[PDB]
Design a protein around this ligand. Structure first.
Ligand SMILES: CCCCCCCC/C=C\CCCCCCCC(=O)OC[C@H](COP(=O)(O)OCC[N+](C)(C)C)OC(=O)CCCCCCC/C=C\CCCCCCCC
Ligand SMILES: CCCCCCCC/C=C\CCCCCCCC(=O)OC[C@H](COP(=O)(O)OCC[N+](C)(C)C)OC(=O)CCCCCCC/C=C\CCCCCCCC
Ligand SMILES: CCCCCCCC/C=C\CCCCCCCC(=O)OC[C@H](COP(=O)(O)OCC[N+](C)(C)C)OC(=O)CCCCCCC/C=C\CCCCCCCC
Ligand SMILES: CCCCCCCC/C=C\CCCCCCCC(=O)OC[C@H](COP(=O)(O)OCC[N+](C)(C)C)OC(=O)CCCCCCC/C=C\CCCCCCCC
Ligand SMILES: CCCCCCCC/C=C\CCCCCCCC(=O)OC[C@H](COP(=O)(O)OCC[N+](C)(C)C)OC(=O)CCCCCCC/C=C\CCCCCCCC
Ligand SMILES: CCCCCCCC/C=C\CCCCCCCC(=O)OC[C@H](COP(=O)(O)OCC[N+](C)(C)C)OC(=O)CCCCCCC/C=C\CCCCCCCC
Lengths: 705, 705
């Protein structure tokens, strides 16, 4: 089967190169913009017949320079978020190249010697033609060779810890080098104040003014109070639609006047009567502007519509950090102050939630997520069993009998049990985001981090265990509740080696296909070129998210974390996974890198704040691998193996706490020394400027233009 | 046995009143100071033949006024720490009086009806003469009466939560009312700075000056750097001994000149020669003062003896809170700043520990404490087995054979297996304190909190489980590792009801004897009246801790927490515990209260900072009780009981998180609004004062007078 696994790997990787070579269709085809190639439009890098000269690019024109770019240049090119979200793949490569080489060179000799040693079969074809069981399953039960495996785990853990520390430090520095060296972010001068207490007869702005004038003098440039502006929101959306229509009309008329074609409201007939179709639109523009002026200034100064919150902006980064990192009032749930996110980041929907409501919602949704993940299968199984092809017979399917069906469509109709499951798994990121938004979090970044954690846990349970143990998740939970605390590692560890090869197959299929497509799939082409004729036109109306808002940290960090888990679990047990997984990282660190160059924007941007999240998951996967190896070595009766492999997770958790205490605070909480240096430098560079004008207009709302 | 339990309770409570009546020996005996009665000496309330007129106090002269005192008066009398440490007993009373009355009035009827209902035996002696099994053990297996028990648990939990919230709020307010209304605490203006980084050629004081002048301007009154002054410490101790000797000599000479008795160094003979014994002592006083002046000023300004730390004192409470609650430098483990404890509180021994050393020590001692608690019995069993009466035979015990022994001493020689155990349990608070100090914590209060947590966990495991399950703790851990996760509650809950009566006996003996003695025991009299003739004299030389430094929060909070555990576990199962335990609380809330009046000082004083610790333990004990009740009701096959009693702990933990998020921050981290009001009031009251002189002398060291 070793020959078979080599051949299957070759076929899959050759299909990978085939997708990479159909990637060489762009820049030869007419209009040469299949991948939207946002490079000049990503951050407006220049925004605002074709028979010869092929020149045979041979994909050499993109392959090396995705590596040939300075890294600060990449940071300014895309942002610290995306550079770190590629440094995650680079990290994974750093974990699994030395582990791979050392694991092979030490285990595989020691591992594959049980039959005999120092023989003449090395030159024979039996060297590389037998079963691919040069894994821990080859060693007899009580042989001392198992000791080697033990030490390898230690080494691997230590090595992983090394990079996980070094890596961590690196990203920390980068975030700091991001905050100190940047150009005029309003969020550095602003603090979100939440849950101010009601007063008898005093406007909320009056409360905030008095409170932050008494308690934060010498500072407190200004403050913006928040409000529920729903009418203004729909009106400005209508204004944006009208603006798009007017721009389209003007462009068409300049392209072709058509003797002043006046067509409007022709669908309704008598309504509109198609008077002028130009003066009409400017009429709605003027009208909309009128009620926005009339009501925009009215909603701000009225009660029963001003929820308790504000974005207080200060005169100094030092002062803003001071107000953000302290608590103000005797009640720790009143006058909450936190570092204001980027104005783009803010989640304006959840700034009016009392503390008791927060706690209630968090408990409700923790229970709900538990019930979701552990009773994953019951409702979808029920509905799929209800959705039967024989039970769907009705008057309409009379023309849709088996006579015309089942030809090329029978695959989907027979795979419908998989269709319902795939439907739910496709909605799952959305369910996790909804459950995150319900428990108010106020910042898109925190929403994404919470959804990433929920997805990580759900993905762990379902994918990992349902791959390793029997089918249903709730019965698996019941069984694990009815096994000893010393039996769970034993059963999962003993089940690992047979699923080794299935995990090899999953790595190739899922990971390799994902990265191979990720350069360009059906989906981006079929959305963009269809939206070409669907929404407005080819590419105008820059109020749109067809170009991806952000490469998913919500979705995608959990997947590569799962691959971390596979790599760490199978390093001491069956190292045959360990080369294949490497290739995935390799290709990933290419594709997404090049992808980060060309087609991804930033929906928000918060200084790689998510990294401690990732680091915690890597430590968790490492501990899981150590526990499963301890269980497996417990099953295959060895020397004292439970003590070593149970003391190792303790050391891993201790190192995790060291990292969580040392480098982690730099990702949430802004040092005073850095603020003081930046403020002194800013005063030296620009000795005069009106900060008030630049500040008290960035945290109003997106609706208030 | 119900008659037997009533009689035993009567005997124990009558012995309690007998100890309370021998408590009526003071104030009739000559010199009437058996209990040292520190009331006038506790905080110097006035510091600096006897045949008729007995007047028959009849312990009515202390019994009511221990309740008849305003509570702010008590706070100023002893401190917020001790008032809260009595409010813990008051809390316990508030938990267990309504639970007691409602549990009796609802359960005991419903509980004791299984044989039949609406009978004529109520007037018969069988009403209150049978076995005391009107407990949950009386109800048949599948009877729906168990539902009642379920709801009771809910009610009890809810009620407990109620007080635990209300209580919590109350103490929070008190701490705030303590900090805002107080007279000139230096700690309110000072922040402990730790782990400053080394510099090439710059004194540590220079580093701190520059750092806090650049980053904390408009503030930073001064700073005190710390040092290792060991020689100065022993020299000043010798100075204190010499001062005591001189004071004793002067007092004796004034009492009796004895023709100028000149006796000194008479033990050595030729040494000293007893020249004058007065000019000699003033000579050592002058000499000691000389080298203290010479070396005290030299050790401060030299390297290799100044560890990285300082106590930076500011110009405003607002500024001090700002510096305490923020982080300064890019490295979160460098330039650590925390609210300075009281100068008395500071643990000067652990202000020079890098972060990596802290983490290493914490892991080492977490592992060590685990091994201590779970292998509690092995070494002491080994040493006791080695210490045999027959194996101790030697040349010395020739005169100490059985001929003269075993008469009245055979009890101890046969109880030696208990003697070794009791010895270890007596040293256990000291071991916990040592293990707390090893992991540097910088503040006596934090040392006490950590030791209290360690004692709580150890006490839980050993006392509780070894009372409920079989003997050895390590074999108990092995068994619990080899039982299912669904079997631990089952086994402990089923073991609860038979140990109910043993817990009744433990409550009377241990708790009642402890509170009964706690008014006055053998130990305080035999230490004080012996120290009368041992150390110096009756009561002079006020450099001594014979009067207790502090009523033990280190030791004693864990014990009454264990009693909380007993009360919460046995409310739905066997309510017969529940009156008896009440009495203990009652007597406790008297004795310690009166005790807090008369004989306890404050070794340190930090604004009842330990309360969230206590609240967390109460929530933990509540959850443990709910789990054990779920296990018991699982054993006695009832209606669906696992769901209700497993959803209840989730709600308990959620409420605990709500409390931990709302009221808890007020106990560690000083609000800015309160600081601003206090500073404005202080400026208004005293518009002029030199803060520098009052500040830069309180955080130097105790050695630098
Ligand atoms: C060309 C020279 C002669 C070739 C003779 C071949 C005869 C084959 C037999 C029947 C053909 C008609 C089949 C009718 C319905 C098929 C039922 C069926 O079983 O279908 C699926 C199968 C298997 O594929 P799958 O299940 O994995 O699904 C695709 C999934 N995915 C997109 C991810 C790759 O495939 C198929 O049937 C076969 C797929 C054939 C079509 C491929 C795509 C064609 C696109 C353009 C054709 C020209 C259009 C011009 C439009 C101009 C407008 C202005
Ligand atoms: C080259 C010479 C040979 C020429 C052939 C001539 C004779 C045969 C001609 C036609 C017979 C077609 C045979 C079967 C058609 C298959 C329909 C079908 O495959 O449907 C299901 C698929 C969706 O399932 P999926 O697994 O592929 O993607 C799931 C997700 N992913 C993206 C991950 C893969 O959807 C789809 O293919 C969308 C298909 C419809 C698109 C619009 C068509 C234009 C409007 C009307 C024309 C006829 C309408 C028929 C209505 C039925 C459409 C379903
Ligand atoms: C005879 C009886 C006729 C009855 C007439 C009834 C009236 C007409 C009614 C309906 C007809 C149209 C059916 C529309 C089907 C499209 C929807 C669909 O299909 O729902 C399956 C998936 C949906 O998306 P999702 O579940 O993945 O994610 C969803 C969520 N999210 C994005 C967050 C991850 O979509 C897919 O699978 C789509 C991929 C389909 C691939 C198969 C292609 C068809 C095969 C050959 C055609 C060859 C053309 C040659 C072209 C040359 C040009 C390059
Ligand atoms: C290739 C397409 C061919 C279209 C031919 C249409 C010919 C005329 C017949 C019907 C016209 C209505 C067509 C409706 C299907 C559109 C195809 C489709 O791809 O749908 C896409 C939608 C959107 O996808 P999204 O959730 O990811 O974006 C929302 C969330 N965001 C923004 C974050 C991404 O997905 C959905 O709604 C659910 C998926 C679609 C399920 C369709 C069920 C149709 C069955 C019976 C007919 C029902 C009434 C039909 C008439 C209605 C209009 C009058
Ligand atoms: C009637 C009026 C319009 C009707 C409605 C049309 C609406 C549909 C529009 C778009 C949707 C689908 C486009 C997909 C067609 C491309 C096919 C392709 O991607 O092929 C790849 C596969 C490779 O084989 P496999 O191992 O995956 O086995 C088959 C899969 N399994 C293993 C599961 C059985 O081959 C195959 O599909 C098997 C087919 C035989 C080999 C290729 C046939 C020639 C293909 C295209 C002709 C040129 C098109 C020019 C126009 C382009 C402009 C759009
Ligand atoms: C000449 C011969 C005649 C032949 C006749 C047939 C020819 C074809 C006819 C028409 C083709 C029109 C082509 C355009 C189609 C566009 C498809 C589309 O636009 O796809 C995407 C949209 C999502 O919007 P967006 O992200 O682009 O907006 C952006 C969000 N912004 C505004 C905030 C930026 O998808 C959506 O429309 C949302 C729909 C989601 C569906 C979920 C399932 C709903 C559940 C039950 C429905 C049951 C049926 C009853 C329906 C009653 C109400 C109609």
């Amino acid at each position: 089967t070793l020959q078979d696994i080599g051949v299957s790997a070759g076929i899959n990787i050759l299909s990978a190169f085939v997708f990479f070579i159909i990637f060489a269709v762009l820049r030869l085809q007419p209009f040469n913009d299949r991948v939207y190639f946002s490079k000049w439009y990503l951050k407006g890098l220049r925004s605002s017949v074709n028979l010869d000269f092929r020149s045979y690019m041979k994909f050499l024109n993109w392959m090396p320079e995705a590596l040939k770019m300075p890294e600060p240049e990449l940071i300014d090119h895309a942002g610290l978020d995306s550079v770190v979200y590629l440094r995650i793949y680079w990290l994974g490569l750093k974990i699994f190249t030395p582990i791979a080489v050392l694991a092979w060179a030490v285990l595989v000799p020691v591992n594959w010697t049980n039959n005999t040693l120092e023989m003449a079969k090395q030159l024979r074809n039996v060297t590389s033609s037998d079963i691919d069981k040069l894994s821990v399953s080859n060693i007899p039960e009580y042989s001392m060779r198992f000791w080697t495996h033990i030490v390898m785990a230690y080494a691997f853990t230590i090595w992983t810890c090394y990079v996980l520390m070094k890596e961590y430090e690196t990203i920390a520095n980068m975030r700091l080098q991001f905050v100190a060296s940047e150009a005029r972010r309003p969020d550095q001068f602003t603090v979100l104040v939440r849950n101010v207490p009601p007063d008898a007869d005093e406007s909320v702005s009056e409360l905030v003014e008095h409170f932050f004038l008494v308690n934060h003098p010498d500072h407190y440039l200004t403050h913006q109070v928040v409000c529920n502006a729903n009418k203004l929101a729909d009106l400005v959306k209508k204004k944006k639609k009208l603006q798009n229509w007017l721009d389209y009309y003007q462009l068409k008329y300049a392209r072709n006047n058509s003797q002043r074609i006046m067509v409007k409201l022709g669908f309704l007939g008598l309504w509109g009567q198609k008077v002028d179709a130009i003066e009409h639109y400017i009429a709605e523009i003027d009208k909309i502007s009128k009620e926005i002026s009339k009501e925009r200034e009215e909603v701000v100064n009225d009660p029963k519509a001003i929820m308790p919150a504000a974005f207080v902006s200060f005169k100094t980064r030092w002062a803003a950090a001071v107000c953000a990192q302290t608590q103000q009032t005797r009640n720790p749930t009143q006058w909450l102050t936190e570092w204001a996110p980027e104005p783009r980041d803010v989640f304006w929907s959840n700034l009016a939630i009392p503390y008791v409501s927060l706690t209630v919602r968090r408990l409700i949704m923790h229970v709900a997520f538990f019930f979701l993940t552990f009773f994953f299968i019951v409702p979808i199984a029920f509905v799929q069993s209800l959705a039967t092809i024989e039970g769907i017979v009705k008057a309409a399917p009379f023309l849709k009998f088996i006579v015309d069906d089942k030809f090329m469509k029978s695959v989907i109709q027979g795979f419908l049990p998989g269709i319902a499951l795939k439907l739910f798994l496709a909605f799952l990121p959305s369910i996790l985001m909804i459950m995150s938004k319900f428990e108010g979090f106020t910042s898109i970044s925190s929403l994404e981090r919470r959804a990433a954690f929920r997805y990580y846990i759900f993905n762990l349970v379902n994918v990992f265990l349902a791959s390793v143990i029997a089918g249903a998740a709730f019965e698996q939970l019941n069984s694990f509740l009815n096994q000893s605390a010393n039996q769970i590692p034993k059963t999962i560890g003993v089940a690992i080696p047979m699923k080794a090869t299935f995990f090899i197959t999953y790595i190739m299929v899922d990971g390799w296909a994902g990265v191979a497509g990720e350069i360009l799939m059906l989906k981006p082409l079929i959305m963009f070129h269809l939206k070409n004729a669907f929404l407005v036109k080819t590419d105008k109306d820059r109020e749109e998210a067809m170009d991806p808002g952000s490469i998913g940290f919500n979705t995608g960090e959990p997947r590569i974390q799962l691959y971390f888990l596979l790599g760490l679990v199978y390093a001491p047990v069956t190292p045959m996974l360990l080369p294949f997984i490497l290739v995935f990282f390799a290709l990933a660190y290419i594709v997404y890198r090049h992808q980060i160059i060309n087609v991804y924007n930033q929906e928000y941007e918060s200084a790689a704040a998510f990294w401690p999240d990732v680091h915690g998951r890597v430590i968790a996967a490492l501990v899981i691998s150590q526990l499963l190896l301890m269980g497996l070595l417990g099953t295959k009766h060895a020397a004292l193996a439970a003590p070593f492999l149970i003391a190792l997770p303790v050391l891993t958790i201790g190192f995790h706490h060291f990292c969580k205490g040392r480098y982690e605070p730099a990702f949430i909480r802004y040092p005073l020394q850095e603020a003081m240096m930046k403020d002194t430098l800013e005063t030296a560079r620009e000795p005069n400027l009106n900060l008030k004008g630049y500040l008290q207009n960035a945290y109003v709302h997106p609706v208030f233009k």
